[PDB]
């Protein structure tokens, strides 16, 4: 089960991905998460990516493709994987084609979680994340049982640094320019699947899960 999740900032990649990996046990690979992990560990990669991430800009293709190529070669991707937020540019998509062709693991489905851009600002500014496990909540749409703490581990919740009005707007602008070219690319490949992500989380997942049977 080789999957790719794409969508505009805040569309629900992390939320849907969490559910996919629990049911199928494939590794959840988020380039966003990888960059932030690096930023925390303060590796040279982390510091370099930080400049772009903080501004809402895309981290350059070369270094991004590099960390994904290495990640996909790990033993835990033997039975499949869930790419989240990558590819994000046609260039990345073409590179991934070569990478998976070398690894012998072609993509089964590219799932595009479609959400109207006009509601994404609310989704991100209201997002709260667990500092311990990374699962996300929303002040209005999916609030924690107790304000400021994770239902699972009791860890303190926080607001991602780039989830502010200015940066969110920038992220939306930047990623808007990549959507259509990416959709056309995979639609041409023959395995693009569009899912209406503007419904309750479990309703969205039902459609996502419908695509995974037999993989
Ligand atoms: N390939 C690449 N190339 C170059 N640069 C790269 C790169 N990949 C990453 N980067 C860099 O890294 C940065 C960060 O990347 P990344 O972390 O991947 O940013 P993103 O694409 O903007 O996605 P988000 O994490 O913000 O949102 P999501 O879709 O997972 O949503 P979630 O499930 O949390 O949901 C959001 C909120 O909505 C709520 N929610 C979820 N579903 C619903 C629903 N159905 N109804 C109502 N609310 C919902 C949630 O509770 C939550 O509060 C980029 O800006 C870029 O700089
Ligand atoms: Mg995410
Ligand atoms: Zn947690």
Swiss-Prot record:
* PROSITE patterns found in the cross-reference section: ADENYLATE_KINASE (PS00113)
Q: Which reaction does it catalyse?
A: AMP + ATP = 2 ADP
Where does the chain bind Zn(2+)? 130, 133, 150, 153
Q: Where in the cell is it found?
A: Cytoplasm
One GO biological process this protein is involved in is: nucleoside monophosphate metabolic process
Q: Name one GO cellular component term.
A: cytoplasm
Entry EC number(s): 2.7.4.3
Binding site residues for ATP: 10-15, 127, 136-137, 199
Q: Which residues bind AMP?
A: 31, 36, 57-59, 85-88, 92, 160, 171
Induction (UniProt): By superoxide.
Record-stated family: Belongs to the adenylate kinase family.
Q: How does it assemble?
A: Monomer.
State the protein's name.
Adenylate kinase
What is the name of the gene encoding this protein? Answer: adk
């Amino acid at each position: 089960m080789n999957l790719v999740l794409m969508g505009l900032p805040g569309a629900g990649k992390g939320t849907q991905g969490e559910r996919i990996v629990e049911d199928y046990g494939i590794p959840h690979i988020s380039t966003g998460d990888m960059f932030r992990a690096a930023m925390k560990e303060e590796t040279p990669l982390g510091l370099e990516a930080k400049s772009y991430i903080d501004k809402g800009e895309l981290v350059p293709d070369e270094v991004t493709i590099g960390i994904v190529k290495e990640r996909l070669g790990k033993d835990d991707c033997e039975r499949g994987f869930l790419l989240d937020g990558f590819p994000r540019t046609v260039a990345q998509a073409e590179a991934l084609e070569e990478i998976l062709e070398e690894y012998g693991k072609p993509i089964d489905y590219v799932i595009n979680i479609e959400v109207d851009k006009d509601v994404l600002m609310e989704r991100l500014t209201g997002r709260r994340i667990c500092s311990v496990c990374g699962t996300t909540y929303h002040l209005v749409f999916n609030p924690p049982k107790t304000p400021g703490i994770c239902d699972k581990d009791g860890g303190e919740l926080y607001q991602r640094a780039d989830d502010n009005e200015e940066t969110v707007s920038k992220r939306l602008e930047v990623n808007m320019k990549q959507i259509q070219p990416l959709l056309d690319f995979y639609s041409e490949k023959g395995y693009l699947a569009n899912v209406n992500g503007q419904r309750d989380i479990q309703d969205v997942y039902a459609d996502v899960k419908d695509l995974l049977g037999g993989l």
